[PDB]
Every structure is written in C-alpha cells, then in structure tokens.
Amino acid sequence: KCEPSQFQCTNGRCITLLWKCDGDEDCVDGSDEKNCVKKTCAESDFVCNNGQCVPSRWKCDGDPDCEDGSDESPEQCHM
C-alpha cells in the first residue's frame, strides 16, 4: 500500500494523484484514466456519434477506426 498522496495502479505501483484523470495513460493496464469523469475531447479531437475521442485526421481516411464506423460513414464524410 501507499499513502493517500499517491493513487494505486491495479498493478501494485502507485503514481501521484496529479497523474490520475489527466488524459495520459500512466498505468500498465490504464487503471488511472478509465475511471474518472474527464470525458472531454480536445479542441482538435473529433467526436464519434458513439462518443469516442478520435483525432480529426482519422476522419474519412479510408479505413474504419471508430466502433460504430461513423468516422467512415458516407453521411459523415461524403465520398
């Protein structure tokens, strides 16, 4: 264990709270990001109809990237 000044990975090694819910994966299994409510997308980040945060460059790149395929739907980017 470790002090409340540190957040425990689900591995055994604990990183500080400033590194938790900061948009950066610094847990081996990512248990420091996929628990907090910071679901915001960046200024340049495209948003799927499914809510996933995908880079804007990935949109209509020719290959499906997002779970629902909205990134490559003909409606979302005309072809």
The site partner of 28 among Ca ion, other proteins, none (C-beta below 5 to 8 Å per kind) is: other proteins
49 binds Ca ion per the rule CB under 5 A: no
Q: Does 45 participate in binding Ca ion (rule CB under 5 A)?
A: no
Task: Name the residue among 3, 6, 51 with its Cα closest to residue 32.
Answer: 6
Look at residue 32 and give the partner it binds from other proteins, Ca ion, none, a contact being a CB closer than 5 to 8 Å depending on partner kind. Ca ion
Question: In angstroms, rounded to a whole number, what is the distance separating the alpha carbons of residues 32 and 8?
Answer: 8
Contacts of 54 (CB under 8 A, 6+ apart): 45, 46, 47, 48, 65, 66, 71
29 binds Ca ion (CB under 5 A): no
Write out the residues near other proteins by the rule CB under 8 A: 5, 16-19, 24-26, 28, 30, 44, 55, 57-58, 61, 63, 65
